[PDB]
Design a protein around this ligand. Structure first.
Ligand SMILES: Cc1ccc(OC[C@@H](O)CNC2Cc3ccccc3C2)cc1C
Length: 288
């Protein structure tokens, strides 16, 4: 597992986004981040065109995504629910509020037995990604830590991740990354000074993993756009640059692989017949 590919799914960056299970059945990706629980602590989900049904109270109710989560899991994929994204319709006032919210997540999305409305029926996520983008850090470390306690009650391994941008420390998930046990850091090396072709600062994140992260086994991911149209800048089509980049970063145990925004883009974008996500997967496997 220096060879994992993580993809965001749910926000249909490419327009042509297919079902979650379609991408799990592909073999080019290992970890799927459902984008997003964009409203909290008062729960709200958004998955663009992939789910429109609701409970009476307006909370999304997503029977096809639920079935696909189960299919994905049977095929050995991990499926995390991603909190946040670009909306900022989310904020904690304090750690206590965020700790209460851990229970809410556990009973709504995990193996908690507390009866609440379950957007994915009896399907159970494999954990949570913290894609916090509003530059407010209150509550996340306490939420993460409480979740770790609750996960012991479950019957499988759960994962927590965060999605910083490359500048260090991150203004939204820096405190989380420094103060809680996190499995994966999906670090965005684009739209920033520290992108791969800018002043690439992998070395800083390595220092973080080795000396700061409460989990010394945290895995770091090279976070990239999945196509030229998936973000404004920092898409890498130069496969020599990708090879050399992977070469440099794969020579520690802290390297986890590559994270992509998003499935729709990375799977549909071809060089020039071959899916971008497949190019990357094979580069990871060669390097290991
Ligand atoms: C329509 C829409 C599309 C994207 C939205 O949020 C997109 C971004 O915030 C994506 N954050 C992820 C976080 C991450 C981690 C590694 C590699 C890439 C990326 C991008 C929100 C809305 C409402």
């Amino acid at each position: 597992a220096n060879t994992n590919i993580a993809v965001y799914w749910g926000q249909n960056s490419a327009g042509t986004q297919e079902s979650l299970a379609t991408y799990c059945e592909s073999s080019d990706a290992d970890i799927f981040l459902l984008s997003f629980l964009n409203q909290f602590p008062t729960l709200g989900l958004n998955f663009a065109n992939a789910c429109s049904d609701t409970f009476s109270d307006g909370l999304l109710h997503c029977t096809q995504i639920a079935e696909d989560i189960e299919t994905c899991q049977s095929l050995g994929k991990k499926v995390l629910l991603s909190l946040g994204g670009a909306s900022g319709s989310y904020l904690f006032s304090d750690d206590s509020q965020a700790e209460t919210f851990a229970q809410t997540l556990w009973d709504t999305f995990g193996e908690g037995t507390g009866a609440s409305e379950r957007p994915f029926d009896s399907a159970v996520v494999d954990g949570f990604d913290f894609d916090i983008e509003n530059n407010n850090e209150v509550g996340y470390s306490a939420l993460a830590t409480k979740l770790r306690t609750l996960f012991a009650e479950g019957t499988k391994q759960y994962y927590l991740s965060a999605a910083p941008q490359c500048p260090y420390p991150d203004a939204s998930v820096g405190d989380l990354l420094e103060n809680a046990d996190i499995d994966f850091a999906f670090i965005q090396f684009y739209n920033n000074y520290c992108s791969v072709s800018g002043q690439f600062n992998w070395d800083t994140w390595l220092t973080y993993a080795q000396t700061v992260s409460p989990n010394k086994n945290i895995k770091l991911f090279l976070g990239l756009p999945g196509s030229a149209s998936a973000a404004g800048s920092g898409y890498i089509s130069d496969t020599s640059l990708l090879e050399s980049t992977i070469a440099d970063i794969a020579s520690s145990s802290s390297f986890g692989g590559i994270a992509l925004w998003d499935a729709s883009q990375a799977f549909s974008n071809e060089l020039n017949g071959e899916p971008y996500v497949e190019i990357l997967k094979n580069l990871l496997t060669s390097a290991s």
